[PDB]
């Protein structure tokens, strides 16, 4: 009904804590995920002190109405959280214990520079706005922060869930506010990507490379163009999931390199046929024999260079 | 309004029960399903005891307000359930009968190691938190647990719906809680998968294999590469439904094996043509006649080995 | 406020009636549909009688939440209906007149054994739970059941909308309930399926068959395999709309028959080429001449047999 | 409050009017579309003098819970509209003015015959609730009805916005005595559809038709069959724009005719090759020379006939 | 409570201000985006004037229902905003400071011409309800308006966020002529588009154009038609991210020109083969040498003309 008046000027410290229950629906395109957890609060209020001997009880229970509760809201959320108070208890000295279960959808950017083998950090921000009669700051209760063992994200491994102890005090709208930061660290499960994506593309490229052992123009044209169509289909399948980014990713570079290799192979086949028609088989044979070794070596060198550029 | 005081130290026992009406919308990728069922509660409150002879009634009817109802919550739900109270009846001795109907969306992990022929178990968890003056524990009333005869799931067969009698008692947030487990066991209907997926792939593979009785290079290239394109299309269609898993499944292994077989067939065709160009027809004929027998036997052996590995 | 007391022991009879307005969003995959209709009720309450000569000039109209209203619920609904009362009135003798409007999503199983030419029946259930002091049973008012001339589904033909007069009673949750059944009978409009699906498949099959008049191996391979690819694409397009069933459907049987025919055609072409290359042209010519007539007659006989099996 | 008392047996002529603001999200699969528009009811309330003092010439401003607002309902809506009152200004003379913004999802039939060149109409039905006072009849005020002239509905250009007074077609037990019908004429901008769809198919068809100037049977087969595959792929591409319509359409008829023409072209190629290999080159030359003129003329005549059939 | 009387004859000036917090969910079909921001208002009054003689420098926090607060509504929002009144403070001089956090989705038109390199402007319109007692003048406080500099609108980079004053220009207006316009300017990030789309199309087109250096009719036909199929597949890939735009676009014009070029190439190949068969190799060689130069130059000139036409 009214914030607790201070002694002279001291700030009011609120101890927080989040305990995860469920996290799910991590969207790569929209960069959002859904959470379901607890929220714990604690502060000091001398107006609610009591005598245990005379009252005969050691703990009091209050309804959320007719009692002062600080307004704490999240920053990076789509809407207000769906809250329902669980318990409120008061110690004889005046300490208030608060508990609540909520659910919300959080906004957090992602980095896809190493998309198949990347790790991400997810942030949840809590903020409290100071009242004009009292300054309020936040604190972290490390004993009440954690997660259940049944929590799971489909396709991700959860590593740690911590909080930054130092709040960030800044002045906004002619008022001072404090902000905490909870970080959830995850890594992507990349096992399924290898046999489903990587190896078939290598097989198709190797199949297309068999045009350097034949001298029939029509068969080479058929092989190369059909393998190109298959590559286009696989590119459609791959890009159906990865969103557009303003920077260069590993997978996009690999795909562009494959396209360039297909173009160069078509050029080589055309040159060989054109030379063969002119009754100059020696040059065509030399070019074909050179290309047979040239293509895989350059492919492996380029792959090594890209792997060092993006991961080293 | 206030929990019933204990006699000396006995905990409060609450008897539960869930009766299924409708279960539907099982999503494989999201690993969720929706429910619609009854919830029943019963406990003892001596403060509401009366004498049935004088009062003229054997059962008193109360509203949800002005009576203490324990807080029962589901653990693995995305949002708090939508429920409406049906009836509350009070026995003369003090036993309270409670009933409601709810609907909720449940999160449950799934196992896809035998995806076409797999069986799943779905879990529903009920929890209760102890108040500062009384401890509450849960119990199972076997006479009020069951499912309707009209319950159906699209694509699944429902086998049983039971509950583990023994609850789990543990401490969370400096309070004691009790949790129950309700298990729904289902198995997938795999009839539609055979003629829609399995047989056409075998037919396409045999059409690909038919190229060992020919000697024209262009025809062999056309057959093998076009069958590869058809296999790619079928693989994309299949993968559009099965989600990504951190382990290896049966279908993925089969698909990878088919890709490997196609690659080996392309290699064999190229080798035969190259040998025939160099004026060594006998070696090409021997290789072709050997491959004619080699391919199906190896395919059958690999299928048997995989079947034993995944199901035995 | 309270159920009317019985005279000696008789139950209470409530007569209902549903007037349809809109039915739409009939989904084959989810087996659900949305409805939009009115609802009318009536019952006898001797505690509300009055004398029209003196109590007032006439009878008037009132607002909701004014009189004891029986609570009726739908059984097969995903969520509780969204309603809004529109009118209510009382009779001089004591009987009460009630009305409202609702909208709900209904779950109902479907049968696809004759998918192109199938007819379905949709069920809607109303139930009432008896209170401990009075028994309530449901009745059908035939004069208030019907559908608007503006009721229409997209692609379906509505035939009738009746209600089974006889209710079904059973003891559920230690109480007696009465249930009513409303049946909506519809039929599918199959004309659009002929030129969109059926005829292109026949044209492609005939194009595949046209290869029995040529002796060039490469041309036959091209024709047959490319037509197979086209069939695969068309089949994917078709199957992207028909859900999986534990039984066999007409369309699936036809598609599997088409696949088998393609396999046999490939085998015949390979056999003809193999016989031709071994200096036995007469046998290949005889086989081709026989197949020219063999294929269409077998196709027609198989189609007739399937048509008799699935509709006889 | 209470509705105005009767004075001189004059019916309350509630003059309605809909001021469109936003029409958007036209969904065709369910015949649903949202509308964000204004409203204005201008009934006469002279008797309930709202401070007609001359010195109080200022227009009296009221809140929703200040005066009697008539209760009107929509018939073809999903759920109740979101009534957001803007302002209720009443002049001291007695004339009232009302303004609100509502959002609703409207069920209106959509006809997709003549799909590229269709002019659709949208219907909104209003009904007012009866009151204890004299009969309430809905009336149309031409100054109130209008639109913002800044509609963001892309793909359509709005012709006009009018209204027609009609009776109801429901259970008319001296109720539903006035149902207003509003009509929103719209037309589809068809210019982009020509380059987006029509011309590429004609180019593909002509590419197929180039085979009548060639003699190579393999080249003709490759041309026609690969052109058919391209046509199927382009149909797949087209299907993403059109809605799912279970009835005959001009575009579908065009597609079917294109399939038929492909079939006839394949037949002609086969006949030409058969005659040429049976050594009657004169007849083959005559047929292939006649086809060059026969095909385009028949195609154009069929197009003209179909256009006349489908456009009166 | 009522607005302060115009004793000083001063129309009430209410300085506004919006501070963006989160912007997300930009939609290209419904033309809708969601926002989270602060609504800061600062008007003046004569009542609630205090003196620091006794109370000192004391900020007086009042209740949302105790004092008068002006009513402000958005013009182009789907539903009303979700208000969370944060703080109300009154200065002894009479200045009243009001703050609120809201969430709402905004309707704003989009122009998708010059699609890969386009810019957009998002508009928010604020209006204030008028009262008879005194006028309300809306101003802009340049210190309150701003953004969080950490907005994660994916796919775009934000340029600026300012405001201006415009008249309402509404046909139903009475006294609202002080609307405000908040303009958010964004630009699409087009870097990934080049390697993802543009270069593969050029490679495919050049592979198609390699057919002017050959004389094999079958090889030329295979090259051109397979390249056309690949182009159709790549158009299918491109259509996934392209908005469904019912008017002309730069990308659409480019794609149409590509189709036209494919058609012309097919015609040229047919002409060359016809001349070679009719024994005019000089003319055939002249045409095939001219085409090698003609095609790229005409393509570049058409690209330049189209770019000038679409980009001023
Ligand atoms: C033939 C190749 C067959 C195997 C291909 C996949 C090998 C990847 C397995 C191991 C990856 C691994 O160690 O991941 C962890 C680790 C995490 O690094 P940070 O801590 O972020 O630094 O990831 C890496 O180091 C990844 C290194 C690059 C792997 C590149 C693998 C090959 C990719 C495709 C190349 C050919 C493309 C053909 C299409
Ligand atoms: C741009 C449009 C590209 C069209 C295709 C370009 C390649 C055609 C093949 C040329 C060919 O066969 O030339 C044979 C010719 C034989 O030489 P003589 O004239 O006998 O000396 O070989 C060569 O000239 C060697 C290859 C050089 C051509 C390389 C072209 C690369 C074009 C890349 C363009 C990228 C933008
Ligand atoms: C080959 C032609 C027939 C195909 C269908 C045959 C299988 C139908 C019946 C399956 C069946 O009985 O399933 C029940 C049973 C359930 O086992 P569990 O209880 O989980 O394990 C403990 C006891 N086994 O399943 C099995 O035992 C399955 C055994 C292996 C079946 C393999 C069937 C053929 C698989 C495909 C082979 C060829 C691949 C072709 C391409 C496929 C592309 C996806
Ligand atoms: C990087 C690794 C992959 C690189 C790309 C591989 C493309 C496929 C190459 C096909 C090789 C065909 C060569 C061939 O036919 O030669 C036959 C050759 C000729 O013998 P002589 O008459 O003495 O000469 O004899 C043979 O059959 C040799 C064995 C060839 C098949 C086995 C090698 C296959 C290599 C695949 C590597 C995949 C990893
Ligand atoms: C596992 C089962 C499938 C395995 C892979 C099958 C691929 C397709 C097989 C193609 C068979 C072609 C047979 C062929 O061309 O030979 C014709 C052969 C030659 O006879 P002779 O003149 O005596 O020649 C022998 C002395 N030189 O005669 C025939 O026509 C035999 C009939 C063969 C076709 C019928 C069998 C079909 C097999 C597929 C079964 C699939 C299940
Ligand atoms: C395949 C080739 C068909 C392409 C379509 C050509 C248009 C034929 C039909 C167009 C027509 O009848 O005109 C409709 C339409 C207006 O008439 P309605 O009022 O709809 O009658 O005409 C036009 O303005 C379109 C003319 C160019 C197309
Ligand atoms: C069931 C309906 C579809 C049945 C399967 C159709 C497969 C494709 C048919 C191909 C026909 C080719 C016949 C051919 O080339 O013969 C030419 C033939 C040979 O005559 P002679 O030299 O005297 O002997 O001369 C002709 O031009 C005859 C005309 C036959 C073709 C025209 C009729 C085609 C009918 C198709 C059925 C459509 C339904
Ligand atoms: C409408 C359907 C059009 C199908 C496409 C047909 C194209 C075949 C071109 C005819 C051809 O090759 O003839 C070569 C012929 C032989 O020369 P002479 O005997 O001296 O005469 O030469 C020519 O015709 C010169 C080239 C002009 C052909 C241009 C055709 C353009 C058609 C597009 C119209 C539709 C848009
Ligand atoms: C297929 C051919 C398409 C080539 C790419 C089109 C690039 C030039 C036309 C577009 C253009 O000028 O946009 C400039 C655009 C911004 O335009 P405003 O300043 O708003 O005007 O930004 C750029 O400069 C984009 C540059 C893209 C270059 C792509 C070159 C590809 C290689 C050929
Ligand atoms: Cl919040
Ligand atoms: Cl719950
Ligand atoms: Cl209900």
Swiss-Prot record, chains A, B, C, D, E:
GO terms for cellular component: plasma membrane. InterPro entries: GABAA/Glycine_rcpt (IPR006028), Neur_chan_lig-bd (IPR006202), Neur_chan_lig-bd_sf (IPR036734), Neur_channel (IPR006201), Neuro-gated_channel_TM_sf (IPR036719), Neuro_actylchol_rec (IPR038050). Changing residue 238 to M: Displays an increased sensitivity to propofol but not to desflurane. Changing residue 251 to A: Marked gain of function, with a ten-fold shift of the proton dose-response curve towards lower concentrations. Also shows slower apparent rate constants for activation and deactivation. Tetraethylammonium (TEA) and tetrabutylammonium (TBA) inhibit the proton-activated currents in a dose- and voltage-dependent manner in vitro, whereas the blocker of acid sensing ion channels, amiloride, has no effect. Channel current of GLIC can be inhibited by inhaled and intravenous general anesthetics at and below concentrations used clinically. Ion conduction is also inhibited by lidocaine and by divalent transition metal ions such as cadmium ions. The chain crosses the membrane at residues 190-212, 216-240, 249-277, 281-312. Belongs to the ligand-gated ion channel (TC 1.A.9) family. PANTHER family: NEUROTRANSMITTER GATED ION CHANNEL. This is Proton-gated ion channel. It comes from Gloeobacter violaceus (strain ATCC 29082 / PCC 7421).
């Amino acid at each position: 009904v009214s914030p607790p008046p201070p002694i002279a000027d001291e700030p009011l410290t609120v101890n927080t804590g989040i305990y995860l229950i469920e996290c799910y629906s991590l969207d790569d395109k929209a960069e959002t995920f859904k959470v379901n957890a607890f929220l714990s609060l604690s502060w000091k209020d001398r107006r609610l002190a009591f005598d245990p001997v005379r009252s005969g009880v050691r703990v009091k229970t209050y309804e959320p109405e007719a009692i002062w509760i600080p307004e704490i809201r999240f920053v990076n959320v789509e809407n207000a959280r769906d809250a329902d108070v669980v318990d409120i208890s008061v110690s004889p000295d005046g300490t208030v214990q608060y508990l609540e279960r909520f659910s919300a959808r959080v906004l957090s950017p992602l980095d896809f520079r190493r998309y198949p083998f990347d790790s991400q950090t997810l942030h949840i921000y809590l903020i409290v706005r100071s009242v004009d009669t009292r300054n309020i700051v936040l604190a972290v209760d490390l004993e009440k922060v954690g997660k259940n063992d049944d929590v799971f994200l489909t396709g991700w491994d959860i590593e740690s869930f911590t909080a930054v102890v130092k709040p960030a005090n800044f002045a906004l709208e002619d008022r001072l506010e404090s902000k905490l930061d909870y970080q959830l660290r995850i890594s992507r499960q990349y096992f399924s990507y290898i046999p489903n994506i990587i190896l078939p593309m290598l097989f198709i490229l190797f199949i297309s490379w068999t045009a350097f052992w034949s001298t029939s123009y029509e068969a080479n044209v058929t092989l190369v163009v059909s393998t190109l169509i298959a590559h286009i289909a696989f590119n459609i399948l791959v890009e159906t999931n990865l969103p557009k980014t303003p920077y260069m990713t590993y997978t996009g570079a690999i795909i562009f390199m494959i396209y360039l290799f297909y173009f160069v192979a078509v050029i080589e086949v055309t040159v060989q046929h054109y030379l063969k028609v002119e009754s100059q088989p020696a040059r065509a044979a030399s070019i074909t024999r050179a290309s047979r070794i040239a293509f895989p070596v350059v492919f492996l060198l380029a792959n090594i260079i890209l792997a060092f550029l993006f991961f080293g």
